[PDB]
Amino acid sequence: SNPTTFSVEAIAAYTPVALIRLLNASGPLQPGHRVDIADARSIYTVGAAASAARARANHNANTIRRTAMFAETDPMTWLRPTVGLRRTFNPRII
Amino acid sequence: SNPTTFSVEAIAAYTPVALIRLLNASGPLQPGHRVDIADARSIYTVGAAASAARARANHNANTIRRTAMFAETDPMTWLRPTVGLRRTFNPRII
Amino acid sequence: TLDVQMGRFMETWADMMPHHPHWVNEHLTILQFIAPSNPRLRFELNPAFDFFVAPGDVDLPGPQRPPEAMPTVNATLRIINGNIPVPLCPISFRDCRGTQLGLGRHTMTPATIKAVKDTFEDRAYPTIFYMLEAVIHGNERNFCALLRLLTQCIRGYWEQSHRVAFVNNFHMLMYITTYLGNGELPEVCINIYRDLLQHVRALRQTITDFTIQGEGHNGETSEALNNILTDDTFIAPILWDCDALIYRDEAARDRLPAIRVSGRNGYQALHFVDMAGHNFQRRDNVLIHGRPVRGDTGQAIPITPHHDREWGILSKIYYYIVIPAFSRGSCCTMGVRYDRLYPALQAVIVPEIPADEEAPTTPEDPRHPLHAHQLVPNSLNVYFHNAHLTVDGDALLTLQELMGDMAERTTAILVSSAPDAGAATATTRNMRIYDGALYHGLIMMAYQAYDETIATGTFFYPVPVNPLFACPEHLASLRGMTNARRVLAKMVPPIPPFLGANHHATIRQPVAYHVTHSKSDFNTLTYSLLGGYFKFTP
Amino acid sequence: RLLTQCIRGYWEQSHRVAFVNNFHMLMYITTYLGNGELPEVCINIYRDLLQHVRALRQTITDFTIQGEGHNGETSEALNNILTDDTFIAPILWDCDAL
Amino acid sequence: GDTGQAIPITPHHDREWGILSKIYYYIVIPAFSRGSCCTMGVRYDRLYP
Amino acid sequence: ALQAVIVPEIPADEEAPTTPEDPRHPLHAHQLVPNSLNVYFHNAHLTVD
């Protein structure tokens, strides 16, 4: 995060981008500066996806861990069959 | 506000007029005096619109700031699309 | 990237035709067609062949600019018997034959007919369904990852307008019938989906009924030698996975195939593209197959089809009978703009619910995701609120783990083959059939032009490949459309020449005219279209 | 909000349809307030009126023959009047028709 | 776009809007009203206050 | 496959749970472990005590 420093948009920019619910793209821009720009777009998309996935962080005390989803090995599979959970319930745990 | 002084109707009269929910037009008149009168009326309606927009003043503690309402720039438009809101929600915050 | 190609076609086509084409005038009656003033009369000699004028000394497919040469008369094979022109084979005869075919077979109850007809003529259909159908892209893993969100979305769309969602593409009603059919959805919706699927299987059983088994020549089964919807050489108008191409390439094997995927011949079929290596502006011929679940992706692992061969037949039957019988020439096939769709899906404002607290359900509390206090502009909550649908926090959070599997971009696939072994003499092998398809393409039911909450052409751009899916009104979504191009495409169905031409394709203009100018019924229209799709091979 | 409340209040008290004289009202109701703000019966009525209008337009374009235009006039405008651009609506709200 | 002062006037909607408006006003309105409706102007100076 | 039942223990002088919303229900998500009979019953969306 430092020293990078922070996203002014600016087409340099930095890869994380670990913000939550950002009112920064709009926001001012205002507008973008006079840079050649090619990506920009791809690195912003990867950084936003990584920022959201890290921005989960919590809600895993509310999980209810993930499952095998469908029926597949599960490398034991010689003394009981395998069945996955259809994810239709409410993962809340209270 | 002062000194002009107050609206007795009177056709001179003054442009603000910064009241709200006035029981003054009717009210007495009673009737109007001996003035040639042509406007009056236009200054009255712009003063009334100003005296309503100013008489909002509050109710902005429950805004919920206004949006673009349509899909227009928004001077970036190169790293995400732009979508406006349809104003059908109930803005009160509470 | 299929935008520049469509723009070049629309620029060249504004002055390519100086007169009315002779193959679109199918509204002639028999007395006017027969009369000697008709210039098309002298080119109708053999009932199994179409005759036209063609450029000489050109090897199809040629370059983008058509080379200058003297015109010569070429011929092609009328594969279907529904390609016989409408003055020679009328609409009333086709509808009576369809009534004859559907004597005791399965019919659709009027409830699902009314609901599907309502959702096909809906102009306020929410675009969030199109974005969801584009980003799931027909993978079973993504659909079962999004089960709660799709259940809440379908329920919210059903018990507010009494219409049926996700009906445009075929890889949704299988997944709804198989997975969301045990009681997650209400009783009427699953009955509607099951009735649509029952009608599709009844059409397939009718195909099997009117053929004779045990007669297979050169690795072609008898139904594929009789019908077209059971022919594995012919492919669906839109594709979501590379299984149909594998079945077509292994099925024909003697009728000389040639498939062109955005440049050089052949496909690469590399699956499991994720966030690290997406490369939206890819100029290669790499197609995204998706993740098979029971196995490993790897790199040296050979590709396998997801589903059985019956899935391709049912998809062809659905897209070629049920969709044009309901839409009646109003739906159009288009690709998607993934480089604008994917950044718009990364904005979710699911709040921070503290521990030992209940998750809010109603949207009247400030902690709900679709409460107005967290209804920030330019997000996905505004997309869901414009559609007036209620979803929870976790239903919006499931897209994050949808994002591990993604699609790069849409592309246009032009396959070609010789006619089948039944009608392949020494002179019909030079005649070839050219038909097009859209990899990772979408179909919208009806087009809205006056919905200004989303700017036009933001996600979808019209690239139509069928006479059935001709869209004279969807072309306003394309950038740079004039009134001259609109009135030019109103009378002639705009098909780009890099996706096949009308006279060289399998599905031609007369079956489209039959599906767009018949007013009989909805069951008898489907059975009449099925009686249309029978080969004229001896 | 105000128009939704007004239409709902006029609907579920006398079962009648509001804002039906103006043509630039039912298009805006169908396009914007058609996703579920209004009850399930009203939006069906507005969609039915718009669908009947478009069916009349398709009937107009069915009985003409395209591809025969003279002096930069379309064949539908040369055959009919409701597709003729010279003829104008009785009520104008915008200057685009002129 | 913007309002401006020197920007020339563009149409709000496409050509099909005029055709549908003419079809509505000249067919659907007189079929339902049966010659009872009447076009009138408005008095904006007595309506806006 | 029929050996695995994940019914929890209910304390004495307490009412048995009926709705599947409480954590004490066998078909609640807390007592929905993979590869047991409870996921077989939950796949069919069937409620049992």
Side-chain angles (χ1 to χ4, degrees), chain C residues 198-264:
Chain C
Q198 270 166 60
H199 197 258
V200 170
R201 302 207 211 190
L203 292 176
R204 201 258 183 274
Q205 186 64 31
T206 279
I207 286 185
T208 279
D209 202 327
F210 264 84
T211 195
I212 287 175
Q213 324 273 329
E215 263 171 48
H217 294 97
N218 318 352
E220 281 267 26
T221 179
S222 168
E223 315 160 271
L225 221 53
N226 187 19
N227 209 293
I228 267 179
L229 308 178
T230 57
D231 205 331
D232 297 324
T233 313
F234 196 48
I235 58 178
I238 54 141
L239 272 82
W240 294 112
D241 45 353
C242 266
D243 50 350
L245 290 185
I246 291 170
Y247 286 144
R248 172 206 166 268
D249 276 348
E250 97 169 22
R253 208 206 49 243
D254 61 83
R255 320 156 41 192
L256 323 168
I259 165 169
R260 300 199 61 93
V261 191
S262 84
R264 62 184 192 272

Side-chain angles (χ1 to χ4, degrees), chain C residues 95-118:
Chain C
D95 284 0
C96 269
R97 183 222 278 155
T99 282
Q100 189 196 34
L101 293 188
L103 202 42
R105 319 272 206 285
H106 169 266
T107 179
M108 293 165 70
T109 171
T112 175
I113 286 176
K114 193 250 287 181
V116 169
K117 190 194 69 172
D118 266 359

